[PDB]
Amino acid sequence: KTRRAEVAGGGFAGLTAAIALKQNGWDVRLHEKSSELRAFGAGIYLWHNGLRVLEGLGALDDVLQGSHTPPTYETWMHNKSVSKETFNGLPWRIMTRSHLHDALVNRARALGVDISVNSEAVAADPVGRLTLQTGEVLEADLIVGADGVGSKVRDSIGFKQDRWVSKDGLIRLIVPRMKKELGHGEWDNTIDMWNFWPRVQRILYSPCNENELYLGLMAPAADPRGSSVPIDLEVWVEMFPFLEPCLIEAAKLKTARYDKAETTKLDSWTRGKVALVGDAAHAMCPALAQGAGCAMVNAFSLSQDLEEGSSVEDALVAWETRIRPITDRCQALSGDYAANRSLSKGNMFTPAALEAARYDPLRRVYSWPQ
């Protein structure tokens, strides 16, 4: 009768998988290691592909209300605008991480997904067992490893992988828009503000709504001023003086952290009844803003393959075969862009860069052609 899924991880990948499975009539239980349900990273972009997953999950309206689509995606090199991109209408959106995480949480609770906090997966067995840190062993028809880049569900089984960490990172914060204090300009835009001279510092400027601005402040990890948290106000204001009012607000934040991106690429995403989804399987460089989009699409697509009449084992193989190449291509191009600083040139959201974004998981076609 009722098939049972056990989901490890309460981030975007696990919440998506749980809602999608619960909508399809699975009895789903989700285990989050932290003692509360929360998302870190300040703010996030979604594109059409992820917005369509939110549509599929019945969470799109709660996300659109209180989030923002800029008039254009603008790039600056040394304070000179080099490009303005609108992607031929392809939907996209900027929001805080808690905004998106709360909508997914509220939808999971509305459907009756069983959520356990302080509940950490430490091992999984392909025969359909999940072991928690308490020792408790759970049996199920499907085990979803949505437990992030340091996945114990993945590493307890052993998956061949390439896993590494970027040299440099950034500080991500949410501050008031301060729109009046910013004065004349195009302050509803996304503005990716690059500089190599006098020093390597960059700010990704990302309005989330009329009240909240997501800033990503990026400097080399070896720069002891640019990499400091709480931020070293003077070194940011010096290169970004037109954002002083916002930077003053950022400088007050105690909760800011300098984070380096970590990636993982595996040969396989499945082992018997175990599927790995999201960062657990395919964490990637930040450049195309698609790590959570691909997580959500992959989690949603897993639920679709499980509706085919097949064994869970054969549905997982079919899932990875069908959907993985979109993520593999997206991760490769993002890695290339990050390492080569390619977004600094502007006009880099090409049709190939935009592939993952254009994919509609609901109809399983590419839309929004370029």
Ligand X SMILES: Cc1cc2nc3c(=O)[nH]c(=O)nc-3n(C[C@H](O)[C@H](O)[C@H](O)COP(=O)(O)OP(=O)(O)OC[C@H]3O[C@@H](n4cnc5c(N)ncnc54)[C@H](O)[C@@H]3O)c2cc1C
- Of all helices (H) and strands (E), which one includes residue 167? strand 161-176
Residue 337 Cα to chain centre, angstroms = 17
In the shown chain, the binding pattern of residues 86 to 125 toward ligand X, with x for contact by CB under 6 A and - for none, equals ----------------------------------xx----
With CB under 6 A as the contact rule, the residue among 142, 174, 292, 354 that binds ligand X is: 292
With CB under 6 A as the contact rule, the residue among 32, 74, 232, 355 that binds ligand X is: 32
Shortest spacing between CB 369 and ligand X, in angstroms: 21
- Cα–Cα distance, 78 to 276 (Å, whole number): 41
| Close Cβ partners of 125 (under 8 Å, ≥ 6 residues apart) | 131, 143, 157, 274
- Subset of 251-270 contacting ligand X (CB under 6 A): 259, 261
Residues 116/31, Cβ–Cβ less than 8 Å: yes
Q: Give CA separation, 28 vs 18, 23, 58, 306, 344, in Å.
A: 6, 10, 17, 14, 44
Cβ neighbourhood burial of 69 (10 Å; 0-12, 13-18, 19+):
middle
361 binds ligand X (CB under 6 A): no
In the shown chain, the binding pattern of residues 125 to 154 toward ligand X, with x for contact by CB under 6 A and - for none, equals ---------------------xxx---x--
Q: Under rule CB under 6 A, how many of the chain's residues touch ligand X?
A: 33
207 binds ligand X (CB under 6 A): no
Among 119, 103, 116, 92, CA closest to 39: 103
In sign, the C-alpha dihedral spanning 295, 347, 344, 205 is negative
289 binds ligand X (CB under 6 A): yes
- Subset of 50-79 contacting ligand X (CB under 6 A): none
Q: Count how many residues are written for the chain.
A: 370
| Close Cβ partners of 309 (under 8 Å, ≥ 6 residues apart) | none
13 binds ligand X (CB under 6 A): yes
44 binds ligand X (CB under 6 A): yes
With CB under 6 A as the contact rule, the residue among 115, 174, 239, 295 that binds ligand X is: 295
Cβ neighbourhood burial of 288 (10 Å; 0-12, 13-18, 19+):
buried
Q: Return the amino acid letter for 193.
A: M
- Subset of 300-359 contacting ligand X (CB under 6 A): none
Nearer to ligand X, 21 or 261 (CB): 261
With CB under 6 A as the contact rule, the residue among 5, 6, 11, 316 that binds ligand X is: 11
- Cα–Cα distance, 109 to 115 (Å, whole number): 8
With CB under 6 A as the contact rule, the residue among 128, 207, 278, 335 that binds ligand X is: 278
Nearer to ligand X, 82 or 117 (CB): 117
Shortest spacing between CB 4 and ligand X, in angstroms: 17
Nearer to ligand X, 191 or 289 (CB): 289
In sign, the C-alpha dihedral spanning 154, 155, 159, 162 is positive
CA angle 316, 318, 323 (to 5 degrees): 95
Shortest spacing between CB 181 and ligand X, in angstroms: 26
Shortest spacing between CB 160 and ligand X, in angstroms: 19
**Residue 309: how many CB atoms within 10 A of its CB?**
7
In the shown chain, the binding pattern of residues 150 to 179 toward ligand X, with x for contact by CB under 6 A and - for none, equals --x-----------------x---------
Shortest spacing between CB 76 and ligand X, in angstroms: 19
Nearer to ligand X, 243 or 299 (CB): 299
Binding site for ligand X (CB under 6 A): 8-14, 31-34, 41, 44-45, 120-121, 146-148, 152, 170, 259, 261, 278-279, 283, 286, 289-293, 295
